[PDB]
Amino acid sequence: EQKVLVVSFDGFRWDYLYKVPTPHFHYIMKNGVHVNQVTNVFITKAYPNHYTLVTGLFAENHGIVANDMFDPILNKSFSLEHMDIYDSKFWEEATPIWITNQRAGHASGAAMWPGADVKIHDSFPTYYLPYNESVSFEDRVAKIIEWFTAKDPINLGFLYWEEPDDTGHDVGPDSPLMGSVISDVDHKLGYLIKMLKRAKLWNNVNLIVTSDHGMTQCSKQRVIELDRYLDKEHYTLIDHSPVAAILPKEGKFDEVYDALAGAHPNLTVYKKEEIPERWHYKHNDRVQPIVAVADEGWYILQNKSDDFLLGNHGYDNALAEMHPIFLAHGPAFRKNFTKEAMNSTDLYSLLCHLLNLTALPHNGSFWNVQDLLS
Ligand SMILES: *[C@@H]1O[C@H](CO)[C@@H](O[C@@H]2O[C@H](CO)[C@@H](O[C@@H]3O[C@H](CO[C@H]4O[C@H](CO)[C@@H](O)[C@H](O)[C@@H]4O)[C@@H](O)[C@H](O[C@H]4O[C@H](CO)[C@@H](O)[C@H](O)[C@@H]4O)[C@@H]3O)[C@H](O)[C@H]2NC(C)=O)[C@H](O)[C@H]1NC(C)=O
Ligand SMILES: *[C@@H]1O[C@H](CO[C@@H]2O[C@@H](C)[C@@H](O)[C@@H](O)[C@@H]2O)[C@@H](O[C@@H]2O[C@H](CO)[C@@H](O[C@@H]3O[C@H](CO)[C@@H](O)[C@H](O[C@H]4O[C@H](CO)[C@@H](O)[C@H](O)[C@@H]4O)[C@@H]3O)[C@H](O)[C@H]2NC(C)=O)[C@H](O)[C@H]1NC(C)=O
Ligand SMILES: Nc1ncnc2c1ncn2[C@@H]1O[C@H](COP(=O)(O)O)[C@@H](O)[C@H]1O
Ligand SMILES: Nc1ncnc2c1ncn2[C@@H]1O[C@H](COP(=O)(O)O)[C@@H](O)[C@H]1O
Ligand SMILES: *[C@@H]1O[C@H](CO)[C@@H](O)[C@H](O)[C@H]1NC(C)=O
Ligand SMILES: *[C@@H]1O[C@H](CO)[C@@H](O)[C@H](O)[C@H]1NC(C)=O
Ligand SMILES: *[C@@H]1O[C@H](CO)[C@@H](O)[C@H](O)[C@H]1NC(C)=O
Ligand SMILES: *[C@@H]1O[C@H](CO)[C@@H](O)[C@H](O)[C@H]1NC(C)=O
Ligand SMILES: [Zn+2]
Ligand SMILES: [Zn+2]
Ligand SMILES: [Zn+2]
């Protein structure tokens, strides 16, 4: 019976491995697999990308299209910043893998993974923690290890940590201060490895270490200010930057579109049905009528006092800076092997294969990632 632990270090851009010594990441690489370029999903934010990892679906299919959404059929909002994510209907266009695992008779465990503390199709992971950012990494690891060794043990665990995303936002990925947080995340990975070894799990758990997206440098010299073009009374801004999800008030669609389209060289304004197919974003009623996408490193501010951060993400998923790390170690994985590319939609197919689960309909392909396996 194979076991899998998926770890997400939020916002761990693929090339952060090289910013400072990362001996514990390199230990997994030498004894495991590493994928250089993981194409994640648009928009390149936490909630769409973590749900893709556990469904194998693009965002237009699994329905978690952003961290901040408005569903016009439900007439309900979803907002990560307000901790307003627990309305089950926002999640139920798909089924995450822990439910499929449990329907097959296994137990799953989740330590702060996005959505794992949400009731979905009347179900939770067998074991989970109510989301609380203040819980230490070491306490999250302790629960995971406890669950893998419990009287009724899990075969599938999910572990989430908010760095290096948090600091990346604050200082920007180009800051020399990033080295400190990357070194700390490497140290935390080392702690996890040590605890897996102490619990006699290191050589019988397949450890997969990845992330939701990367990070790019922003600047107060690279700002698009919407109120230079648009009357704030004539639309609602559902999501702000770098993918502005715009709901014009009744009658104002042409006004808003004509004022904003072509108004700034680094803001590309799409009507919903003209959104690029390659983003697999548009076929969902939670995609707003106008979606305005800032170019890499540009910030959208509704007005002068809107939020600004020196690092951000959410940009085009073709951009290298938006791509996350991916590496893994375990009995099912090759050793000292490097692969050039994968799609993050493929992880679900890999998980279902490792766990001997029947995958639900998805957008990835096991055949794309079979060469990672021993
Ligand atoms: C934010 O928005 C700005 C627009 O305001 C974008 O800037 C443009 O970027 C494009 C490339 O993406 C530039 O086009 C390239 O220009 C090169 C010449 O650049 C100089 O000269 C122009 C005037 O002609 C100035 O505007 C510019 O500042 C430079 O001083 C050409 O050499 C390029 O052609 C070559 O490459 C292309 C492939 O890229 C080939 O197809 C060609 O055959 C040729 O080999 C190309 O024309 C454009 O000049 C930039 N404009 C400005 C004002 O700088 C930013 O890209 C955008 N930001 C982001 C992050 O997307
Ligand atoms: C959709 O749902 C919202 C409530 O849900 C909240 O907003 C959603 C957009 C979404 O984000 C949800 O997640 C979120 O929980 C309903 O919003 C209500 O809207 C009414 C107006 O239709 C508001 O009442 C108005 O409030 C004004 C400010 O105080 C006031 O001036 C208005 O008075 C005028 O109209 C009334 C009503 O006819 C009249 O009696 C007066 O004399 C005057 O003319 C009016 O009271 C509520 O505050 C909003 N409720 C909440 C809980 O926020 C929205 O109605 C709903 N839409 C549909 C189509 O169902
Ligand atoms: N259930 C939750 N409630 C509130 N915030 C959360 C939750 N899950 C994750 N987060 C936050 O989501 C942020 C990541 O979003 P993002 O910037 O898109 O990567 C992290 O800083 C977390 O603190
Ligand atoms: N109250 C409403 N109920 C149902 N459909 C509406 C309503 N308001 C606008 N629409 C729809 O939006 C379309 C375009 O309207 P307009 O937004 O005025 O360009 C209409 O043809 C309707 O299908
Ligand atoms: C999260 O944990 C800390 C203590 O570990 C506590 O102060 C805080 O109240 C917790 N949050 C919730 C919502 O209970
Ligand atoms: C920007 O908009 C917010 C929200 O409507 C408002 O509270 C704030 O005062 C505005 N700031 C400026 C500088 O106009
Ligand atoms: C990613 O998916 C696309 C479209 O399904 C496919 O053409 C491409 O080969 C995939 N890439 C990898 C590395 O699996
Ligand atoms: C993704 O998979 C879903 C489920 O089968 C399907 O409806 C959708 O068409 C797929 N998307 C693409 C672009 O293949
Ligand atoms: Zn993130
Ligand atoms: Zn972030
Ligand atoms: Zn945070």
Coordinates of C-alpha atoms and ligand atoms in Angstrom, one line a residue:
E1 CA 0.0 0.0 0.0
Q2 CA 1.8 3.1 -1.2
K3 CA 1.6 6.3 1.0
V4 CA 2.0 9.9 -0.1
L5 CA 2.7 13.1 1.7
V6 CA 2.2 16.3 -0.4
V7 CA 3.9 19.4 1.0
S8 CA 3.1 22.9 -0.3
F9 CA 5.5 25.7 0.7
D10 CA 3.4 28.5 -0.6
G11 CA 5.0 30.8 -3.2
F12 CA 8.2 28.8 -3.7
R13 CA 9.3 29.9 -7.1
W14 CA 11.2 27.1 -9.0
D15 CA 14.6 28.9 -9.0
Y16 CA 14.6 29.8 -5.3
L17 CA 16.6 26.6 -4.9
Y18 CA 19.6 28.5 -6.2
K19 CA 19.3 31.8 -4.3
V20 CA 21.0 30.4 -1.2
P21 CA 22.4 27.0 -0.1
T22 CA 19.5 24.6 0.0
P23 CA 21.1 21.4 1.3
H24 CA 17.8 19.7 2.3
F25 CA 16.2 20.4 -1.0
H26 CA 19.4 19.1 -2.7
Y27 CA 19.3 16.0 -0.5
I28 CA 15.9 15.1 -1.9
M29 CA 17.1 15.9 -5.4
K30 CA 20.1 13.6 -5.1
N31 CA 17.9 10.8 -3.7
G32 CA 14.8 11.6 -5.8
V33 CA 13.2 13.4 -8.7
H34 CA 13.1 17.1 -9.7
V35 CA 11.1 18.8 -12.4
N36 CA 12.6 22.1 -13.7
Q37 CA 9.4 23.8 -15.2
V38 CA 6.0 23.1 -13.8
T39 CA 3.3 24.9 -15.7
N40 CA 0.7 25.7 -13.0
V41 CA -2.8 27.1 -13.7
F42 CA -4.2 30.5 -14.4
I43 CA -4.8 32.5 -12.3
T44 CA -1.6 31.8 -10.5
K45 CA -2.9 32.2 -6.9
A46 CA -3.2 29.8 -4.0
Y47 CA -6.8 28.7 -4.1
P48 CA -7.1 27.8 -7.8
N49 CA -3.7 26.1 -7.8
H50 CA -4.1 24.0 -4.7
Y51 CA -7.5 22.8 -5.8
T52 CA -5.9 21.9 -9.2
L53 CA -3.4 19.8 -7.4
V54 CA -6.1 17.7 -5.7
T55 CA -8.5 17.5 -8.7
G56 CA -6.4 17.5 -11.8
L57 CA -8.7 20.1 -13.3
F58 CA -8.3 23.6 -14.8
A59 CA -10.0 26.4 -12.8
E60 CA -12.9 26.8 -15.2
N61 CA -13.8 23.2 -14.4
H62 CA -13.2 22.9 -10.6
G63 CA -14.8 26.4 -10.0
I64 CA -12.2 27.9 -7.6
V65 CA -11.2 30.5 -10.1
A66 CA -9.7 33.0 -7.7
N67 CA -9.0 33.8 -4.1
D68 CA -11.8 36.4 -4.3
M69 CA -14.9 35.5 -6.3
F70 CA -18.5 36.4 -6.9
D71 CA -21.0 33.7 -8.1
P72 CA -23.9 35.5 -9.7
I73 CA -26.1 32.4 -9.7
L74 CA -25.6 31.9 -5.9
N75 CA -25.4 35.7 -5.4
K76 CA -22.6 34.9 -3.0
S77 CA -19.0 36.1 -2.5
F78 CA -15.9 34.1 -1.6
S79 CA -13.0 35.9 -0.1
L80 CA -9.7 34.5 1.2
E81 CA -8.8 37.8 3.0
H82 CA -12.0 37.6 5.1
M83 CA -11.6 33.9 5.7
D84 CA -14.8 33.6 3.8
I85 CA -14.1 30.3 2.0
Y86 CA -16.4 27.9 3.9
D87 CA -19.5 28.0 1.7
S88 CA -19.4 24.4 0.3
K89 CA -21.1 25.4 -3.0
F90 CA -17.9 27.2 -4.1
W91 CA -16.1 23.8 -3.9
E92 CA -18.6 21.3 -5.2
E93 CA -18.1 21.6 -8.9
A94 CA -15.3 19.1 -8.3
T95 CA -14.3 16.4 -5.8
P96 CA -10.9 16.6 -4.1
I97 CA -8.7 13.5 -4.0
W98 CA -9.1 13.0 -0.2
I99 CA -12.8 12.2 -0.7
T100 CA -12.0 9.7 -3.5
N101 CA -9.4 8.2 -1.3
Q102 CA -11.8 7.8 1.6
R103 CA -14.5 6.4 -0.6
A104 CA -12.0 3.7 -1.5
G105 CA -11.6 2.8 2.2
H106 CA -8.5 4.8 3.1
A107 CA -7.9 7.7 5.5
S108 CA -6.5 11.1 4.6
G109 CA -5.0 13.8 6.7
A110 CA -4.5 17.6 6.2
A111 CA -2.5 20.1 8.1
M112 CA -3.6 23.6 6.9
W113 CA -4.0 22.7 3.2
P114 CA -6.4 25.1 1.4
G115 CA -9.9 23.8 1.5
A116 CA -9.2 20.8 3.6
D117 CA -11.2 22.3 6.5
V118 CA -14.2 22.9 4.3
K119 CA -17.1 20.6 4.1
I120 CA -17.3 19.3 0.5
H121 CA -20.0 16.9 -0.7
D122 CA -20.8 16.5 3.0
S123 CA -17.2 15.2 3.7
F124 CA -13.9 16.3 5.3
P125 CA -10.5 14.6 5.3
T126 CA -10.5 11.8 7.9
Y127 CA -8.2 14.0 10.0
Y128 CA -7.7 17.8 9.5
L129 CA -6.9 21.0 11.4
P130 CA -9.1 24.1 11.4
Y131 CA -7.0 26.6 9.4
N132 CA -4.8 28.7 11.7
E133 CA -1.8 30.4 10.3
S134 CA -0.3 30.8 13.9
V135 CA 0.2 27.0 14.3
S136 CA 3.9 26.3 14.0
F137 CA 5.4 24.3 11.2
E138 CA 6.7 21.8 13.8
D139 CA 3.2 21.3 15.2
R140 CA 1.8 20.8 11.6
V141 CA 4.5 18.2 11.0
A142 CA 3.8 16.5 14.4
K143 CA 0.1 16.0 13.4
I144 CA 1.0 14.6 10.0
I145 CA 3.5 12.1 11.6
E146 CA 0.9 11.2 14.2
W147 CA -1.7 10.5 11.5
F148 CA 0.7 8.4 9.4
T149 CA 1.3 6.2 12.5
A150 CA -2.1 6.3 14.1
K151 CA -4.2 3.3 15.2
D152 CA -6.2 4.2 12.0
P153 CA -3.4 5.6 9.9
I154 CA -3.6 7.7 6.8
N155 CA -2.1 6.8 3.4
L156 CA -2.4 10.4 2.1
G157 CA -1.3 13.5 3.8
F158 CA -1.3 17.2 2.9
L159 CA 1.0 19.7 4.7
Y160 CA 0.9 23.5 4.0
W161 CA 3.2 26.4 5.0
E162 CA 2.7 30.1 4.2
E163 CA 6.4 30.8 3.4
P164 CA 8.1 31.9 1.3
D165 CA 4.9 33.5 -0.2
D166 CA 4.4 35.9 2.8
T167 CA 7.9 37.3 2.8
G168 CA 8.0 37.3 -1.0
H169 CA 5.1 39.7 -1.0
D170 CA 6.6 42.0 1.6
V171 CA 10.1 42.4 0.3
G172 CA 9.9 41.2 -3.3
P173 CA 11.6 38.1 -4.8
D174 CA 14.6 40.2 -5.9
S175 CA 15.3 41.4 -2.4
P176 CA 18.5 40.2 -0.7
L177 CA 16.1 39.5 2.3
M178 CA 14.7 36.5 0.4
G179 CA 17.7 34.4 1.1
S180 CA 16.8 34.3 4.8
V181 CA 13.3 32.9 4.3
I182 CA 14.4 30.4 1.6
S183 CA 17.2 29.2 4.0
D184 CA 14.5 28.9 6.7
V185 CA 12.2 26.9 4.5
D186 CA 15.1 24.6 3.6
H187 CA 15.7 24.2 7.3
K188 CA 12.0 23.3 7.9
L189 CA 12.2 20.7 5.1
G190 CA 15.2 19.3 6.9
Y191 CA 13.1 19.1 10.1
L192 CA 10.4 17.2 8.2
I193 CA 12.9 14.8 6.8
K194 CA 14.4 14.2 10.2
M195 CA 10.9 13.5 11.7
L196 CA 10.0 11.1 8.9
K197 CA 13.2 9.2 9.5
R198 CA 12.6 9.1 13.3
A199 CA 9.1 7.7 12.7
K200 CA 10.4 5.0 10.3
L201 CA 8.4 6.6 7.4
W202 CA 11.2 8.1 5.3
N203 CA 11.6 5.0 3.1
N204 CA 7.9 4.1 2.9
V205 CA 6.2 7.4 2.3
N206 CA 6.4 9.1 -1.1
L207 CA 7.2 12.7 -0.2
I208 CA 6.2 15.3 -2.8
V209 CA 7.4 18.8 -2.2
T210 CA 5.8 21.5 -4.4
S211 CA 4.0 24.8 -4.4
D212 CA 1.2 26.8 -5.9
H213 CA 3.2 29.4 -7.9
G214 CA 6.2 31.7 -7.9
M215 CA 6.6 35.4 -7.4
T216 CA 7.6 38.5 -9.4
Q217 CA 9.0 41.9 -8.4
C218 CA 6.6 44.8 -8.4
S219 CA 7.3 48.5 -8.3
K220 CA 5.6 51.8 -7.5
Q221 CA 6.9 52.8 -11.0
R222 CA 4.8 50.0 -12.5
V223 CA 1.2 50.9 -11.4
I224 CA -2.0 51.0 -13.4
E225 CA -4.5 53.1 -11.5
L226 CA -8.1 52.3 -12.6
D227 CA -9.6 55.5 -11.4
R228 CA -7.6 57.3 -14.1
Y229 CA -9.9 55.6 -16.6
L230 CA -13.0 54.4 -14.9
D231 CA -15.7 55.9 -12.7
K232 CA -15.7 53.8 -9.5
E233 CA -19.5 54.0 -9.2
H234 CA -20.0 52.2 -12.4
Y235 CA -18.4 48.8 -11.7
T236 CA -17.6 46.4 -8.9
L237 CA -14.0 45.1 -8.5
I238 CA -14.4 41.5 -7.5
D239 CA -10.6 40.8 -7.5
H240 CA -7.9 43.5 -7.7
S241 CA -4.4 42.7 -9.0
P242 CA -2.9 41.4 -11.2
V243 CA -6.0 40.0 -12.7
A244 CA -8.8 42.5 -12.2
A245 CA -12.2 40.8 -12.3
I246 CA -14.6 43.6 -13.2
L247 CA -18.4 43.4 -13.0
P248 CA -19.8 46.6 -14.7
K249 CA -23.0 47.9 -13.3
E250 CA -26.1 47.4 -15.4
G251 CA -25.8 49.4 -18.7
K252 CA -22.1 50.2 -18.1
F253 CA -20.4 47.3 -19.9
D254 CA -19.5 49.3 -23.0
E255 CA -18.6 52.3 -21.0
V256 CA -16.2 50.3 -18.8
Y257 CA -14.8 48.2 -21.7
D258 CA -14.3 51.2 -24.0
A259 CA -12.6 53.3 -21.3
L260 CA -10.2 50.5 -20.2
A261 CA -9.4 48.5 -23.3
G262 CA -6.2 49.9 -24.8
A263 CA -6.0 52.5 -22.1
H264 CA -2.7 51.3 -20.6
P265 CA 0.0 49.3 -22.6
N266 CA 0.5 46.9 -19.7
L267 CA -3.2 46.1 -19.0
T268 CA -4.8 43.7 -21.5
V269 CA -8.6 43.9 -21.2
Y270 CA -10.6 40.9 -22.2
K271 CA -14.3 40.3 -22.5
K272 CA -15.1 37.0 -20.9
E273 CA -15.7 35.2 -24.1
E274 CA -12.4 36.5 -25.6
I275 CA -10.2 35.3 -22.7
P276 CA -7.3 33.2 -24.2
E277 CA -8.2 29.5 -24.5
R278 CA -4.8 28.4 -23.2
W279 CA -5.7 29.7 -19.7
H280 CA -8.8 27.4 -19.5
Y281 CA -10.4 30.0 -17.5
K282 CA -13.5 31.4 -19.2
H283 CA -16.1 28.6 -19.2
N284 CA -17.5 29.3 -15.7
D285 CA -20.1 31.7 -14.4
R286 CA -17.6 32.9 -11.7
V287 CA -15.5 34.4 -14.5
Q288 CA -16.6 38.1 -14.6
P289 CA -17.7 39.8 -17.7
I290 CA -14.5 41.8 -18.0
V291 CA -11.1 40.4 -17.0
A292 CA -8.1 42.8 -17.2
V293 CA -4.7 41.2 -16.9
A294 CA -1.6 43.2 -15.9
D295 CA 1.7 42.3 -17.5
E296 CA 4.4 40.7 -15.4
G297 CA 5.6 43.0 -12.6
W298 CA 2.8 45.5 -13.0
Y299 CA 0.3 46.3 -10.2
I300 CA -3.4 47.3 -10.6
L301 CA -4.6 49.8 -8.0
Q302 CA -8.2 50.9 -8.0
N303 CA -7.1 54.2 -6.5
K304 CA -4.1 55.8 -4.9
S305 CA -4.6 54.1 -1.6
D306 CA -5.2 50.5 -2.8
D307 CA -2.8 47.8 -1.6
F308 CA 0.7 47.6 -3.0
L309 CA 3.2 44.8 -2.4
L310 CA 6.8 44.5 -3.7
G311 CA 6.2 40.9 -4.7
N312 CA 3.1 39.4 -6.3
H313 CA 1.8 36.6 -8.4
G314 CA -1.4 35.7 -10.3
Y315 CA 0.1 36.6 -13.7
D316 CA 0.0 34.5 -16.9
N317 CA 0.9 30.9 -16.1
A318 CA 3.2 30.7 -19.1
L319 CA 5.6 33.0 -17.2
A320 CA 8.6 31.3 -15.7
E321 CA 8.5 33.4 -12.6
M322 CA 5.0 32.1 -11.8
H323 CA 6.2 28.4 -11.9
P324 CA 6.6 26.5 -8.6
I325 CA 9.2 24.0 -7.5
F326 CA 8.5 20.3 -7.8
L327 CA 10.7 17.5 -6.2
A328 CA 9.9 14.2 -4.6
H329 CA 11.5 11.2 -2.8
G330 CA 10.2 7.8 -2.0
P331 CA 10.0 4.1 -2.8
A332 CA 7.9 4.8 -5.9
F333 CA 10.2 7.5 -7.3
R334 CA 13.5 7.3 -9.2
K335 CA 16.7 8.5 -7.6
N336 CA 18.9 11.4 -8.8
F337 CA 16.6 12.1 -11.7
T338 CA 15.8 15.4 -13.4
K339 CA 12.9 16.0 -15.8
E340 CA 12.5 19.2 -17.8
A341 CA 8.7 19.9 -17.5
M342 CA 5.3 18.9 -16.3
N343 CA 1.8 20.3 -15.9
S344 CA 0.5 20.7 -12.4
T345 CA -2.7 19.2 -13.6
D346 CA -0.8 15.9 -13.9
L347 CA -0.2 15.6 -10.2
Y348 CA -3.7 14.3 -9.5
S349 CA -3.2 11.5 -12.0
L350 CA 0.1 10.6 -10.4
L351 CA -1.5 10.6 -6.9
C352 CA -4.3 8.4 -8.0
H353 CA -1.8 6.0 -9.6
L354 CA 0.3 5.8 -6.5
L355 CA -2.7 5.3 -4.2
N356 CA -4.4 2.8 -6.5
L357 CA -7.5 5.1 -6.9
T358 CA -9.8 5.4 -9.8
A359 CA -9.3 9.0 -10.9
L360 CA -12.3 11.2 -11.6
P361 CA -12.4 13.0 -15.0
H362 CA -9.4 15.3 -15.1
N363 CA -7.2 17.4 -17.4
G364 CA -3.8 15.9 -16.8
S365 CA -2.2 12.7 -18.0
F366 CA -0.4 10.0 -16.1
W367 CA 1.5 9.2 -19.2
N368 CA 3.2 12.7 -19.0
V369 CA 4.7 11.9 -15.6
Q370 CA 5.2 8.1 -15.6
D371 CA 9.0 8.6 -16.1
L372 CA 9.3 10.0 -12.6
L373 CA 8.5 6.5 -11.2
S374 CA 11.0 3.7 -10.4
Ligands
LIG1 C1 4.7 46.9 -20.9 O1 4.2 47.7 -22.1 C2 5.3 48.2 -22.8 C3 4.8 49.1 -23.9 O2 4.6 50.4 -23.3 C4 6.1 47.0 -23.4 O3 7.3 47.5 -24.1 C5 7.5 47.0 -25.4 O4 8.0 45.7 -25.5 C6 8.2 45.2 -26.8 C7 8.7 43.8 -26.7 O5 7.8 43.0 -26.0 C8 9.1 46.1 -27.6 O6 9.2 45.7 -28.9 C9 10.5 45.4 -29.3 O7 11.3 46.5 -29.5 C10 12.6 46.4 -29.9 C11 13.2 47.8 -30.1 O8 13.1 48.4 -28.8 C12 13.6 49.7 -28.7 O9 13.0 50.6 -29.6 C13 11.6 50.9 -29.4 C14 11.1 51.8 -30.6 O10 11.2 51.0 -31.8 C15 11.3 51.5 -28.0 O11 9.9 51.6 -27.7 C16 12.0 50.5 -27.0 O12 11.8 51.1 -25.6 C17 13.4 50.2 -27.3 O13 14.1 51.4 -27.0 C18 12.7 45.5 -31.2 O14 14.1 45.1 -31.3 C19 11.9 44.2 -31.1 O15 11.8 43.6 -32.3 C20 12.7 42.4 -32.4 O16 12.2 41.3 -31.6 C21 10.9 40.8 -31.9 C22 10.5 39.7 -31.0 O17 10.4 40.3 -29.6 C23 10.9 40.4 -33.4 O18 9.6 40.0 -33.8 C24 11.5 41.5 -34.3 O19 11.6 41.0 -35.7 C25 12.8 42.0 -33.8 O20 13.7 40.8 -34.0 C26 10.5 44.6 -30.6 O21 9.9 45.4 -31.7 C27 8.6 47.6 -27.5 O22 9.5 48.4 -28.2 C28 8.4 48.0 -26.1 N1 7.9 49.3 -26.0 C29 8.4 50.2 -25.2 C30 7.7 51.5 -25.1 O23 9.5 50.1 -24.6 C31 6.5 46.0 -22.3 O24 6.9 44.8 -22.9 C32 5.4 45.7 -21.4 N2 5.9 45.0 -20.2 C33 5.8 43.7 -20.0 C34 6.4 43.1 -18.7 O25 5.2 42.9 -20.8
LIG2 C1 -27.6 39.4 -3.3 O1 -27.2 39.3 -1.9 C2 -27.0 40.5 -1.2 C3 -26.5 40.1 0.2 O2 -25.4 39.3 0.2 C4 -24.2 40.0 0.2 O3 -23.9 40.7 -1.0 C5 -23.7 39.8 -2.1 C6 -23.4 40.8 -3.2 C7 -22.6 38.8 -1.8 O4 -21.3 39.5 -1.7 C8 -22.9 38.0 -0.6 O5 -21.9 37.2 -0.3 C9 -23.1 39.0 0.6 O6 -23.4 38.3 1.7 C10 -28.2 41.4 -1.2 O7 -27.8 42.6 -0.7 C11 -28.9 43.4 -0.1 O8 -29.2 44.4 -1.0 C12 -30.3 45.2 -0.5 C13 -30.8 46.0 -1.7 O9 -31.4 45.2 -2.6 C14 -29.7 46.0 0.6 O10 -30.6 46.9 1.2 C15 -30.5 48.2 0.8 O11 -29.6 48.8 1.6 C16 -29.4 50.2 1.3 C17 -28.3 50.7 2.2 O12 -28.8 50.7 3.6 C18 -30.7 50.9 1.5 O13 -30.5 52.3 1.0 C19 -31.8 50.3 0.6 O14 -33.0 51.0 0.9 C20 -33.8 51.1 -0.3 O15 -34.4 49.9 -0.8 C21 -35.2 49.2 0.2 C22 -35.5 47.8 -0.4 O16 -36.5 47.9 -1.4 C23 -36.4 50.1 0.5 O17 -37.2 49.4 1.5 C24 -36.0 51.4 1.0 O18 -37.1 52.2 1.3 C25 -35.0 52.1 0.0 O19 -35.8 52.4 -1.1 C26 -31.9 48.8 0.9 O20 -32.4 48.6 2.2 C27 -29.2 45.1 1.7 O21 -28.4 45.9 2.6 C28 -28.3 43.9 1.2 N1 -28.3 42.9 2.2 C29 -27.2 42.4 2.8 C30 -27.4 41.3 3.8 O22 -26.1 42.9 2.5 C31 -28.9 41.5 -2.6 O23 -30.1 42.1 -2.5 C32 -29.0 40.2 -3.3 N2 -29.4 40.3 -4.7 C33 -30.4 39.6 -5.2 C34 -30.7 39.9 -6.6 O24 -31.0 38.8 -4.5
LIG3 N1 -8.5 29.1 5.3 C1 -7.8 30.2 5.1 N2 -8.3 31.4 5.7 C2 -7.6 32.5 5.6 N3 -6.4 32.6 4.9 C3 -5.9 31.5 4.3 C4 -6.6 30.2 4.4 N4 -5.8 29.3 3.7 C5 -4.7 30.0 3.2 N5 -4.8 31.3 3.6 C6 -3.9 32.3 3.3 O1 -3.7 32.4 1.9 C7 -2.5 33.0 1.7 C8 -1.9 32.6 0.3 O2 -2.6 33.1 -0.8 P1 -1.8 33.4 -2.1 O3 -1.2 34.8 -1.9 O4 -2.7 33.4 -3.3 O5 -0.7 32.4 -2.2 C9 -1.5 32.7 2.8 O6 -0.9 33.8 3.3 C10 -2.5 32.1 3.9 O7 -2.4 32.7 5.2
LIG4 N1 -32.6 41.8 -14.4 C1 -32.2 41.0 -15.4 N2 -32.7 39.8 -15.5 C2 -32.3 38.9 -16.5 N3 -31.4 39.3 -17.4 C3 -30.9 40.5 -17.4 C4 -31.2 41.5 -16.4 N4 -30.5 42.6 -16.7 C5 -29.8 42.4 -17.8 N5 -30.0 41.1 -18.2 C6 -29.4 40.4 -19.4 O1 -28.3 41.1 -19.9 C7 -28.5 41.2 -21.3 C8 -27.8 42.5 -21.8 O2 -28.3 43.6 -21.2 P1 -27.6 45.0 -21.2 O3 -26.7 44.6 -20.1 O4 -28.5 46.1 -20.9 O5 -26.6 45.1 -22.4 C9 -30.0 41.2 -21.5 O6 -30.4 41.0 -22.8 C10 -30.4 40.2 -20.5 O7 -30.3 38.9 -21.0
LIG5 C1 -5.1 30.2 16.3 O1 -4.1 29.8 17.3 C2 -3.8 30.7 18.3 C3 -2.9 30.0 19.4 O2 -2.2 28.9 18.9 C4 -5.0 31.4 19.0 O3 -4.6 32.5 19.7 C5 -6.0 31.8 18.0 O4 -7.2 32.2 18.7 C6 -6.4 30.6 17.0 N1 -7.4 31.0 16.1 C7 -8.7 30.6 16.2 C8 -9.6 31.1 15.2 O5 -9.1 29.9 17.1
LIG6 C1 -10.2 54.6 -2.6 O1 -11.4 53.9 -2.5 C2 -11.7 53.4 -1.2 C3 -12.9 52.5 -1.3 O2 -14.0 53.1 -1.9 C4 -12.0 54.7 -0.4 O3 -12.4 54.3 1.0 C5 -10.8 55.5 -0.3 O4 -11.0 56.7 0.4 C6 -10.3 55.9 -1.8 N1 -9.1 56.6 -1.7 C7 -8.8 57.7 -2.5 C8 -7.4 58.3 -2.3 O5 -9.6 58.2 -3.2
LIG7 C1 0.9 19.9 -20.7 O1 -0.4 19.8 -21.3 C2 -0.4 20.2 -22.7 C3 -1.9 20.2 -23.2 O2 -2.6 19.1 -22.6 C4 0.4 19.1 -23.5 O3 0.3 19.4 -24.9 C5 1.8 19.2 -23.0 O4 2.5 18.1 -23.6 C6 1.9 18.9 -21.5 N1 3.2 19.1 -21.0 C7 3.8 18.2 -20.2 C8 5.2 18.5 -19.8 O5 3.2 17.2 -19.7
LIG8 C1 -10.8 19.2 -18.5 O1 -11.5 18.0 -18.0 C2 -12.9 18.2 -17.9 C3 -13.4 16.9 -17.3 O2 -13.4 15.9 -18.2 C4 -13.5 18.5 -19.3 O3 -14.9 18.8 -19.1 C5 -12.8 19.7 -20.0 O4 -13.2 19.8 -21.3 C6 -11.3 19.5 -19.9 N1 -10.6 20.7 -20.5 C7 -9.8 20.6 -21.5 C8 -9.3 21.9 -22.0 O5 -9.5 19.6 -22.1
ZN9 ZN 0.4 31.0 -2.9
ZN10 ZN 0.7 35.1 -2.3
ZN11 ZN -0.2 34.5 5.2

